[PDB]
Amino acid sequence: SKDFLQLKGTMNAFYAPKQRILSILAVNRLFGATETIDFHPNLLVYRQSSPPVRLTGDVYVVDKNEKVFLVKHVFSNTVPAYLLIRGDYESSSDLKSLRDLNPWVQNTLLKLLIPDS
Amino acid sequence: NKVRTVTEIVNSDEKIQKTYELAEFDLKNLSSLESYETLKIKLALSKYMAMLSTLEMTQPLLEIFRN
């Protein structure tokens, strides 16, 4: 939909500007994208919060130094996915290793994170 | 401008006079001051860059201001 744009080089990753959200479909492909946007760190705007914003469910650490996390999220219409967030966050439960994630999301994350030097 | 010096022995009257042009010492002084000031300014600039690095921001300065 027009609410977001598919990230270049990804079949299951998109970004919603008005929401400032990067999302990765758990098991689903994107389709119909006539446009794509190059990934860039600015997209992961650091969320400011005097007390760390609490998070629930499955949480994974991407960059402890940069407060980057991956949060399991299901769209109310029951669409599984993960949200990549950067900011002052804390986890209600124990943080989980990324290896737990499926190869699909893992490949997308590698593409999005490792700079193409 | 210029100066001159006279050497003479106490018991003798045979004196040797030499003349000096101060421009050489002026050049020495100016070069010394220029080098010192350049060093100070470069030191300050390096210190500024270093403390900004200490803040440890990933992006370069211009990218930071563009974001």
Curated annotation (Swiss-Prot), chain A:
Report the locations given in the UniProt record: Host cytoplasm; Host nucleus; Virion
Q: What does this protein do?
A: Required for occlusion-derived virus (ODV) envelopment and subsequent embedding of virions into polyhedra.
Tell me what this protein is called: Protein AC142
Q: What is the lineage of its organism?
A: Viruses, Viruses incertae sedis, Naldaviricetes, Lefavirales, Baculoviridae
Which gene is annotated as encoding this protein in its UniProt record? ORF142
> Which part of the entire sequence is included in the shown chain?
359 to 475 of 477
From Swiss-Prot, chain B:
Taxonomically, the superkingdom here is Viruses
Q: From the entire protein, which fragment is shown?
A: 7 to 73 of 290
| Binding partners and assembly | Interacts with host mus209/PCNA, cdc2 and cdk6. Forms a complex with proteins C42 and p78/83.
Protein name (database record): Occlusion-derived virus envelope protein E27
Compartments annotated for it: namely:
Virion membrane
Q: What family is this?
A: Belongs to the baculoviridae E27 family.
Q: What does this protein do?
A: Acts as a cyclin-like protein and plays a role in the modulation of host cell cycle. May promote G2/S arrest by interacting with host mus209/PCNA, cdc2 and cdk6. The cell cycle arrest is characterized by an intact nuclear envelope, concomitant with sustained activity of host cdc2. However, viral DNA replication still occurs in the arrested cells.
Please state the gene responsible for encoding this protein: E27
